[PDB]
Amino acid sequence: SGFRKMAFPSGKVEGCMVQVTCGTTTLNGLWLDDVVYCPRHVICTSEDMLNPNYEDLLIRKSNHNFLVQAGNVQLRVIGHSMQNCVLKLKVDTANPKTPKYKFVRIQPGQTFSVLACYNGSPSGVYQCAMRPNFTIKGSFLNGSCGSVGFNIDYDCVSFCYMHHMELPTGVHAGTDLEGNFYGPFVDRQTAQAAGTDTTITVNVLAWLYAAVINGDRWFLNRFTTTLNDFNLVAMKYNYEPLTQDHVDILGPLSAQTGIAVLDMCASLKELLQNGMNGRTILGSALLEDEFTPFDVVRQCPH
Amino acid sequence: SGFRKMAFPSGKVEGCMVQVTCGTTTLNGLWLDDVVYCPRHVICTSEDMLNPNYEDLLIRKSNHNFLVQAGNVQLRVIGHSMQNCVLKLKVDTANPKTPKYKFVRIQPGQTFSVLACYNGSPSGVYQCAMRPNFTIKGSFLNGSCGSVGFNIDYDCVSFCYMHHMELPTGVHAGTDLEGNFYGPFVDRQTAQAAGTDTTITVNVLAWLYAAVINGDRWFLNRFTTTLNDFNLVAMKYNYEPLTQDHVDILGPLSAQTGIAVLDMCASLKELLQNGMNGRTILGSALLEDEFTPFDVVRQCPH
Ligand code: NA
């Protein structure tokens, strides 16, 4: 038994992290086959970040301006090409440690694992969730730029995030591996702020189902609320509206526990209005919203 | 910025995970050099689990009774010996993925990364802390036996924990990599109970420091306390006594925050007395004690 926030094993991703340096800037890169993916602002100086024109900046750069190091093996940059907001540096050597991989764009409320890296060396791994406001509440320091977010499904790695910048509120923004930013964010130094974040309601319900599976049942009640009556309460507490698809997705968990989705919603409704009155759920004093219904099934097979 | 429970990169440990089968029992094993380490209860028969004599069970087993599989490759068992509660299987092949490693027995209050495994296949990685009662709060299901806990220092993997069983309360117990159990437990299916779980005080102080680094300062206070006066309050609320060494280890966090360790002690003393008053530190209504001072420094720019 037990339920913990779990990251995917990071071995397949570690073998693709290289150190990319351009000028006086150093960040991380993802080495897949003969291509190294890194954020395109590596070609930016500190003073150019105010209003960088990447088209001319990249064209003024030459191949030898890109110092790619895989550990201490120096990789020769054969070419550089713009990939939206990330760079595609071609190297002469394919990565022997290249795993079965795919580029996937996740939706808000979905989770993934982050392999935090500094100077091309992995430092830690944790689990994140794409917030409704298209940011992530990660742990990124200076030089973490280029750290990648991924999921793993049967030895196939689904890369979904690359870290680019930290927003003023401390949350972090980035792109998918195709170079397209999540949310309205752009890779320049402008007055940028994340929108008002909301709580992933379906994830909380999945987490509550995980608590019931593991024996934590004190929050259950005889009540059953309509989908709309729950949603009105949820809006007042900055919770995402629950959709019918969310109810459908929570179907397997409802069957495994024998508790109807709307019955569990009444439990969450009461929890929102009354609080946890000092009690804990799965060792937590807050309503966790970073476990997808899939994330629960993995840790709670039936 | 940002603070999260961060597990070490699991790549070096993934290469040592193998599947061990004995009779009808299958659990995970640790393949280092030409030796496979796994919990000795793999040789237990179904109805012998209540109170087994492993010396009998080992004499009833030969080398070819152990099925060891590293992925698709079957491993030949040359020898087998019992070291306390750990089964050592000698194989004809040294593991080519064996990293630099050592066997250490961590102290209570220390944290380590757990690589949860099933059928010799890693499935997730998360952070665990050795509770003062020598239990850990993890996510272990059937087949997770042999899942290992480790810390990484530079290129060296310090193996410190192998999972053996789950206590009735749902907490988890295991041994060091030499077969010696953490705490008073024995690998039998009896009614064992862990001791009373006190709170790791030095970890709470580090967590409060990690909060100050990440913005949360509401709990902060001007008055200070001596070590002995704080220890009296800590003893009342089942907190571990705070030694001078704990004060020294917290020094780096004090330097980054500009807050004396004894001043943070007074802020914790106030919190233990008047409680939360409905506020949160780092998104939690309770005090976290599963982050060591080293764990906080890893995520904070000193
Ligand atoms: Na209910």
Residue numbers in the entry:
A (entry chain A), B (entry chain B): 1 to 302
Q: What do the authors report?
A:
Unlike the C145A mutant, obtaining crystals with the C-terminal P6-P1 substituted sequences bound in the wild-type catalytic Cys145 active site was more difficult, with only two examples observed for the C12 and C13 variants. For cleavage site C12, in which we have captured complexes within both native and C145A active sites, crystals belong to space group P21 with 12 protomers in the ASU, four of which create dimers with bound active site complexes. In the C12 PHTVLQ WT structure, the ~2.3 Å resolution map showed the clear presence of a covalent acyl-enzyme intermediate. Given the nature of the C-terminal product-like complexes here, observation of an intermolecular covalent link between catalytic Cys145 and Gln306 from a different Mpro homodimer demonstrates that this reaction has occurred in reverse from product to acyl enzyme states. Remarkably, a non-covalently bound C-terminal product was also observed in the same crystal, but in a distinct active site in a second functional dimer of the 12 molecules of the ASU, providing the direct comparison of a product and acyl enzyme substrate complex both in the native active site context and identical crystallization conditions. In the WT structure, careful analysis of the electron density for the native structure supports both the covalent acyl-enzyme and non-covalent product carboxylate binding of Gln306 in distinct active sites. For the acyl-enzyme intermediate, the thioester bond formed between the Cys145 γ-sulfur atom and the carbonyl carbon of P1(Gln) creates a trigonal planar linkage group (defined by atoms Cα, C, and O of Gln306, and Sγ of Cys145), with Cys145 χ1 angles (defined by atoms N, Cα, Cβ, and Sγ) of ~ −70/−74ο, consistent with our previous observation for the C5 acyl-enzyme intermediate complex24 (−66ο).
